[PDB]
Amino acid sequence: TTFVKLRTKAKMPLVGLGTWKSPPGQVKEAVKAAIDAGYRHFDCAYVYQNESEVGEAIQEKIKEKAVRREDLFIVSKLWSTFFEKSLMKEAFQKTLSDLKLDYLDLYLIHWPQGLQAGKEFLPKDSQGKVLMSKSTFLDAWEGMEELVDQGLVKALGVSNFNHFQIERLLNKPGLKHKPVTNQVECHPYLTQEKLIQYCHSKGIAVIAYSPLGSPDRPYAKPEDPVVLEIPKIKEIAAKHKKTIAQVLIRFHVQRNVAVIPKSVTLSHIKENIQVFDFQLSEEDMAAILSLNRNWRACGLFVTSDEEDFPFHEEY
Numbered sequence: 258t259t260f261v262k263l264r265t266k267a268k269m270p271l272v273g274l275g276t277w278k279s280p281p282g283q284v285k286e287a288v289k290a291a292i293d294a295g296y297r298h299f300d301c302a303y304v305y306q307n308e309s310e311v312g313e314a315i316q317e318k319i320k321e322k323a324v325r326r327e328d329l330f331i332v333s334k335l336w337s338t339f340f341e342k343s344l345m346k347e348a349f350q351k352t353l354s355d356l357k358l359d360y361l362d363l364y365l366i367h368w369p370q371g372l373q374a375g376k377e378f379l380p381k382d383s384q385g386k387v388l389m390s391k392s393t394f395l396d397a398w399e400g401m402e403e404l405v406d407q408g409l410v411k412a413l414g415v416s417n418f419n420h421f422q423i424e425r426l427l428n429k430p431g432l433k434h435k436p437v438t439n440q441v442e443c444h445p446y447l448t449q450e451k452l453i454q455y456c457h458s459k460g461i462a463v464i465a466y467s468p469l470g471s472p473d474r475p476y477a478k479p480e481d482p483v484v485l486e487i488p489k490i491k492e493i494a495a496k497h498k499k500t501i502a503q504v505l506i507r508f509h510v511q512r513n514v515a516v517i518p519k520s521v522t523l524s525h526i527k528e529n530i531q532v533f534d535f536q537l538s539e540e541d542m543a544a545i546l547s548l549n550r551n552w553r554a555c556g557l558f559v560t561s562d563e564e565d566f567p568f569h570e571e572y
């Protein structure tokens with residue numbers, strides 16, 4: 258109930274703790290507090306640059322006997338400047354080393370377009386144009402598959418992929434490890450009906466991020482739709498004696514979609530996991546689903562004209 262079983266028949270907890278934009282130090286405390294509140298799924302990434310702080314938190318809770326490594330699901334992601342196999346292996350060893358773990362439960366392609374290798378996460382030319390690499394997500398996957406055969410990663414997945422891109426991966430000549438999740442932005446204004454149906458029927462679980470609409474996001478504008486403030490959510494929240502955020506998170510759990518709300522605030526961290534004590538009615542689920550406007554806050558929009566750009570397609 259609190260988990261979705263992957264194609265491997267590993268259990269992925271339905272609620273996890275997101276880590277993007279959590280500052281260093283705040284993150285170590287946030288992860289400690291989350292473990293204490295019963296979180297077992299953690300989502301971290303090389304490009305966040307806070308993995309070391311996550312790793313400290315986990316090591317300390319394991320040392321203290323609060324949790325066993327086998328009951329944690331720890332996810333990280335390969336950034337798009339490291340698609341080329343040797344660079345992939347270096348990036349990965351740094352992620353695993355920062356996290357202080359012997360293996361990851363899940364390793365994701367972060368973004369389907371490859372970017373030029375170098376020190377910058379977002380390489381630009383003198384003009385300020387983003388530079389792409391020659392390596393594709395299929396090249397990166399061949400590299401990642403070796404991690405699985407090695408026991409360093411239990412399963413591979415993708416993030417921000419459309420269904421044609423997943424098909425291409427599923428139809429890759431010589432594919433060894435099928436992807437087990439697709440981690441995409443998901444909330445009442447971007448429900449992802451078709452993408453979720455596609456994933457579940459292809460052996461692929463879905464992890465929702467930005468379930469709260471990613472308010473901390475740096476480029477938020479007054480004109481943007483406001484996920485927290487959806488009027489129907491307030492109504493449903495009052496009815497169930499839960500918070501608006503709790504309803505936004507349950508909306509994902511109740512569809513058997515994992516969610517990774519981000520928080521470094523203790524009250525919010527404890528509250529976000531209190532979503533296994535109520536059920537949304539069929540009318541409430543239909544009312545939430547009525548809200549999609551296919552609106553996205555998250556992605557690399559500057560590269561929309563470059564070959565691998567996922568958000569052009571319907572799903």
Ligand SMILES: NC(=O)c1ccc[n+]([C@@H]2O[C@H](COP(=O)([O-])OP(=O)(O)OC[C@H]3O[C@@H](n4cnc5c(N)ncnc54)[C@H](OP(=O)(O)O)[C@@H]3O)[C@@H](O)[C@H]2O)c1
Pocket residue numbers: 274275276277278300301367416417440465466467468469470471472473502503517518519520521522525526528529555
């Ligand atoms: N491309 C990708 O694959 C990708 C992209 C973006 C994110 N992600 C992952 O998904 C996670 C979630 O995305 P997100 O971080 O963009 O946004 P989000 O989880 O929707 O929203 C986070 C924001 O909401 C606040 N918040 C959390 N709980 C709350 C509550 N109960 N009530 C009110 N406010 C609350 C947080 O502040 P406090 O911290 O103070 O609580 C933070 O400002 C990321 O951290 C990361 O792990 C993946």
